Amino acid sequence: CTEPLGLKDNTIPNKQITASSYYKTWGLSAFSWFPYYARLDNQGKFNAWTAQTNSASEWLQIDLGSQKRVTGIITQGARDFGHIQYVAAYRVAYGDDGVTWTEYKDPGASESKIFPGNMDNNSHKKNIFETPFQARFVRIQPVAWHNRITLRVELLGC
Numbered sequence: 001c002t003e004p005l006g007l008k009d010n011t012i013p014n015k016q017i018t019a020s021s022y023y024k025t026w027g028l029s030a031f032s033w034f035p036y037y038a039r040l041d042n043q044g045k046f047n048a049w050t051a052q053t054n055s056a057s058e059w060l061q062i063d064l065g066s067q068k069r070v071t072g073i074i075t076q077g078a079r080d081f082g083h084i085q086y087v088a089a090y091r092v093a094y095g096d097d098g099v100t101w102t103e104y105k106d107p108g109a110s111e112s113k114i115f116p117g118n119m120d121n122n123s124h125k126k127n128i129f130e131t132p133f134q135a136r137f138v139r140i141q142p143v144a145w146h147n148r149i150t151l152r153v154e155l156l157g158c
Contacts, residue, residue, distance in 0.1 A: 001071050001132070001158035005064055008040040008154045016063035021052035023148070025080075033080075033150070035060060040074055040124070040154035048078035050085065051142070051149035058149050061139040063098065070094065071132040072156035077121045077146070085150035086118040089143040094135035101139065107131060114143050132157065 006012040014036035025031030031046070038049035038060055051058035064070075077086020091112045092104040103112035115127045142149045 001069055002128075002156045003158055004040075005068055005070070005155040005157055007038070007062065010039070012062065012065060016065060017049075018061045018063075019049055019051065020058045023050035023052050038151045038153050040076060040152050042152050048076075048150050048152045050078070050080070054145060054149055056141075056143055059139045059141050060151055060153070061098075061137065062153070062155060063137050064155070065136070067096065067134055067136045068155075068157050069132050069134050070129065070138060070155055070157040072126060072128040073115075073140070074124050074126045074154045074156065075118055075140075076124055076152040077118045078150045078152060079121045080148070080150075083147050084121045085146060085148035086121060087140075087142045087145050087149055087151055088117045088119065089114050090117055091115070091141040091143055092129075093139045093141060094133050094137060096136045098137050101137075102133075104129065104133065117144070126156075128156075
């Protein structure tokens with residue numbers, strides 16, 4: 001139960017990947033870093049999701065399309081005009097209706113777990129949830145970043 005859930009191979013459609021906001025270089029639609037570009041190993045100039053602002057109130061939401069057992073996550077950052085960008089730490093939340101959420105916590109913990117993220121633009125960083133959760137929706141909540149909040153993702157499970 002550690003299989004890719006569909007982000008990298010486009011099985012999860014673009015409309016199912018949303019975010020608090022997305023970046024547009026100098027407001028040009030042509031320079032959009034759409035939420036649905038946040039797919040592992042996405043190639044090209046605009047190959048990742050980048051939040052409009054660098055705030056801990058930003059989030060990337062993935063609708064798996066159906067309930068799945070989520071056991072892990074893999075992330076990458078990206079590069080924009082020679083500048084390395086990536087999320088260095090993040091929390092995870094999940095749910096089934098897309099409007100109510102549960103922040104991931106170790107059993108008995110009062111604080112949501114903060115997962116160690118990337119440290120560069122292309123290396124894959126995998127985290128395994130010691131306590132898998134069942135859910136249709138998953139959101140990644142950046143807590144720390146380098147230059148910009150930028151992500152490419154893949155969720156693992158079955």
